[PDB]
Enzyme design. Structure first.
Site, PDB file in Angstrom:
ATOM      1  N   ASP A  18     -17.882 -31.045 -15.361  1.00  0.00           N
ATOM      2  CA  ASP A  18     -17.457 -32.616 -15.479  1.00  0.00           C
ATOM      3  C   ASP A  18     -16.238 -32.747 -14.751  1.00  0.00           C
ATOM      4  O   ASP A  18     -15.703 -33.552 -14.043  1.00  0.00           O
ATOM      5  CB  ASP A  18     -17.393 -32.959 -16.759  1.00  0.00           C
ATOM      6  CG  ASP A  18     -18.930 -33.001 -17.448  1.00  0.00           C
ATOM      7  OD1 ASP A  18     -19.852 -33.145 -16.752  1.00  0.00           O
ATOM      8  OD2 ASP A  18     -19.067 -32.798 -18.700  1.00  0.00           O
ATOM      9  N   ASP A  56     -26.287 -23.286 -10.091  1.00  0.00           N
ATOM     10  CA  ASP A  56     -25.473 -23.205  -8.685  1.00  0.00           C
ATOM     11  C   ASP A  56     -25.741 -21.879  -7.965  1.00  0.00           C
ATOM     12  O   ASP A  56     -24.922 -21.241  -7.482  1.00  0.00           O
ATOM     13  CB  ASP A  56     -23.807 -23.167  -8.880  1.00  0.00           C
ATOM     14  CG  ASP A  56     -23.077 -23.774  -7.603  1.00  0.00           C
ATOM     15  OD1 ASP A  56     -23.822 -24.237  -6.590  1.00  0.00           O
ATOM     16  OD2 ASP A  56     -21.939 -23.509  -7.641  1.00  0.00           O
TER      17      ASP A  56
END
Ligand SMILES: Nc1ncnc2c1ncn2[C@@H]1O[C@H](COP(=O)(O)OP(=O)(O)OP(=O)(O)O)[C@@H](O)[C@H]1O
Ligand SMILES: O=C(NOC[C@H](O)CO)c1ccc(F)c(F)c1Nc1ccc(I)cc1F
Ligand SMILES: [Mg+2]
Length: 287
Positions: free
Chosen positions: A157, A130
């Site tokens: 998740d 990220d």
């Protein structure tokens, strides 16, 4: 550190992302001023504890290029991640105030990002996942640090406009730390020109500085169109070549971290005397 909800006093709000809010806090027992990120999740005890356990690796992260971690815990429907408070905020908010960040600053940012990613790979066998301006933080001592990397697969998740994801990742095929290099390249173009650079600025848009694209259209643009590039008059050839090697669409041909460390842009930037702290403090109005 041992951390729990009642240890903390809120000082102010630092910012908010899609699914988190960050507060500057006082940790009463130690006197430390921290940044506490609160991630609201509705999950059962087994998932909560797996996230917290996975986050414990962050106690082992120790680099001048990585935001420090103090601890993580769960309280009232939220995972707290307590970290080093970076008084300069993110490069995303720096970009807003600056309009554009100049090449020599971006050289120091490039070095810090490369070394941060090298540290995460070599010491922790972690890819970032990220890299983007909002996840590169700066402070008034002139430090530049990575945050919000994917140490916890379960946290990823449980949480799942701009996309910084590489072509290979967007097409659902193999990806590695190479995809982080793409994200860095794109981040650098954004900060250099002052705008998220997909789709490219045309003629009169580049003139002024020197309808928006829907998410599905954007993703298919990244995969199918030629990569973004810097304008060719205003930036050095070494910087343009650096960004180009980062934005090669084939991740096998894209430069890797070792090659970047030795790139002409990096060698030059490393030798330059840049008062980043002084630049930062005056552009965002710090002491
Ligand atoms: N350690 C820190 N010190 C100072 N400010 C911080 C720190 N961590 C985060 N922030 C600020 O808090 C804001 C929210 O961060 P968060 O990671 O939730 O969202 P983001 O990275 O901006 O967005 P997204 O949800 O799109 O990934 C960021 O804009 C950043 O400026
Ligand atoms: O916080 C994360 N990113 O997402 C931001 C959300 O959008 C909030 O809005 C995140 C995601 C996966 C993961 F494994 C982490 F450890 C994360 N946090 C995280 C990682 C390292 C440090 I040093 C400090 C941190 F906080
Ligand atoms: Mg973030």
């Amino acid at each position: 550190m041992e951390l729990k909800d009642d240890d903390f006093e809120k000082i102010s709000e630092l910012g908010a992302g899609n699914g988190g809010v960050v507060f500057k806090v006082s940790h009463k027992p130690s006197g430390l001023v921290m940044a506490r990120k609160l991630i609201h999740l509705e999950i059962k005890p087994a998932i909560r504890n797996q996230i917290i356990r996975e986050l414990q690796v962050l106690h082992e992260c120790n680099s001048p290029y990585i935001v420090g971690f103090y601890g993580a815990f769960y309280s009232d429907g939220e995972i707290s991640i307590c970290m080093e408070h970076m008084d300069g905020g993110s490069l995303d908010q720096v970009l807003k105030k600056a309009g554009r960040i100049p090449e020599q600053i971006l050289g120091k940012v490039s070095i810090a990002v490369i070394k941060g990613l090298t540290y995460l790979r070599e010491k922790h066998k972690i890819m970032h996942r990220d890299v983007k301006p909002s996840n590169i933080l700066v402070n008034s001592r002139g430090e530049i640090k990575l945050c919000d990397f994917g140490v916890s697969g379960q946290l990823i998740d449980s949480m799942a406009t701009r996309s910084y994801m590489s072509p290979e990742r967007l097409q659902g095929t193999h990806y590695s730390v190479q995809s982080d290099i793409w994200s860095m390249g794109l981040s650098l173009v954004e900060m250099a020109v002052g705008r998220y650079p997909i789709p490219p600025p045309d003629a009169k848009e580049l003139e002024l500085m020197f309808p928006p694209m829907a998410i599905f259209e954007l993703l298919d643009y990244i995969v199918n169109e030629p990569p973004p590039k810097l304008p060719s008059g205003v930036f050095s050839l070494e910087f343009q070549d650096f960004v180009n090697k980062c934005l090669i669409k084939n991740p096998a041909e894209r430069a890797d971290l070792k090659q970047l460390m030795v790139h002409a842009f990096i060698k030059r930037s490393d030798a330059e005397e840049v008062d980043f702290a002084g630049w930062l403090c005056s552009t965002i109005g710090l002491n």
